[PDB]
Amino acid sequence: MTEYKLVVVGAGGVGKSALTIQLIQNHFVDEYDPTIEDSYRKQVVIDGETCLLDILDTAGREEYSAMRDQYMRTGEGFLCVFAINNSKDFADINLYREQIKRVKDSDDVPMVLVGNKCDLPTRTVDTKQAHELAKSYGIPFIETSAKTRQGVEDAFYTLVREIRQYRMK
Numbered sequence: 001m002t003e004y005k006l007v008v009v010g011a012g013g014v015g016k017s018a019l020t021i022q023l024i025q026n027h028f029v030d031e032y033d034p035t036i037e038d039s040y041r042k043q044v045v046i047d048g049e050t051c052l053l054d055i056l057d058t059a060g061r062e063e064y065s066a067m068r069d070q071y072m073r074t075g076e077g078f079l080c081v082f083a084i085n086n087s088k089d090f091a092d093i094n095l096y097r098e099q100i101k102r103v104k105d106s107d108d109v110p111m112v113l114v115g116n117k118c119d120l121p122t123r124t125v126d127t128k129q130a131h132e133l134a135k136s137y138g139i140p141f142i143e144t145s146a147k148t149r150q151g152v153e154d155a156f157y158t159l160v161r162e163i164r165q166y167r168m169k
C-alpha cells in the first residue's frame with residue numbers, strides 16, 4: 001500500500017470541503033461549514049493500485065493564514081481550488097502557488113489547478129483563461145462541480161498520478 005499526503009488549498013468558500021466530501025462520502029454538502037482544519041485517512045484504489053490518501057482540508061478564510069507553512073511542509077501534492085466563474089484575476093491561485101514553492105524550496109511541487117462550481121453560469125473566456133494559465137504554469141487544469149460530481153475523481157486522481165511521476169523521476 002502506497003501513501004500520498006494530499007492538501008486542498010484555496011480561498012474561502014471555493015468548494016474545498018465540498019470536493020473532498022464528494023470524494024469520501026458520495027454526497028454534495030449544499031451547506032457551508034467553514035473549515036479550520038480537517039484531516040482524513042482514506043484507502044482508495046486508483047488505476048488498480050491500493051493507495052492510502054492522507055487528505056488535509058484546509059481553511060481558506062484569511063483569519064487562518066498562519067496555519068499554511070506547517071501543512072505546506074508536510075503536503076506532497078496540492079489541489080489549488082478556485083471558483084471558475086469568480087477567478088479573481090488568479091490572485092489567490094498565484095499566492096498559494098508561490099507560498100508552496102517557497103516553503104518546499106522547489107519549483108516542481110505536484111499541483112493541480114481545480115476550477116470548481118462549473119455547474120453555475122460560467123463564461124467561455126474564464127474556462128479558456130484557466131486552461132491557458134495551467135499551460136503557462138506546466139500543471140494540469142481540471143474543471144469540477146462538487147454539486148454534480150463532474151471532475152471530482154479526475155482532480156484527486158490526477159494529483160496522485162503526478163506524485164507517482166515525481167517519485168519515479
Ligand SMILES: Nc1nc2c(ncn2[C@@H]2O[C@H](COP(=O)(O)OP(=O)(O)OP(=O)(O)O)[C@@H](O)[C@H]2O)c(=O)[nH]1
Nearest residue numbers: 013014015016017018030031032035060117145146
Ligand atoms: N453550486 C455549487 N455550490 C458549491 C460547489 N462547491 C461548493 N459549493 C457550495 O459553496 C459553499 C462553500 O463550499 P465549501 O466547500 O464549504 O467551501 P470551502 O472552500 O471548503 O471554504 P473554507 O473551508 O471556508 O475555506 C457551500 O455552500 C457549498 O455547498 C459546487 O461545485 N457548486
Ligand SMILES: [Mg+2]
Nearest residue numbers: 016017034035
Ligand atoms: Mg472548507
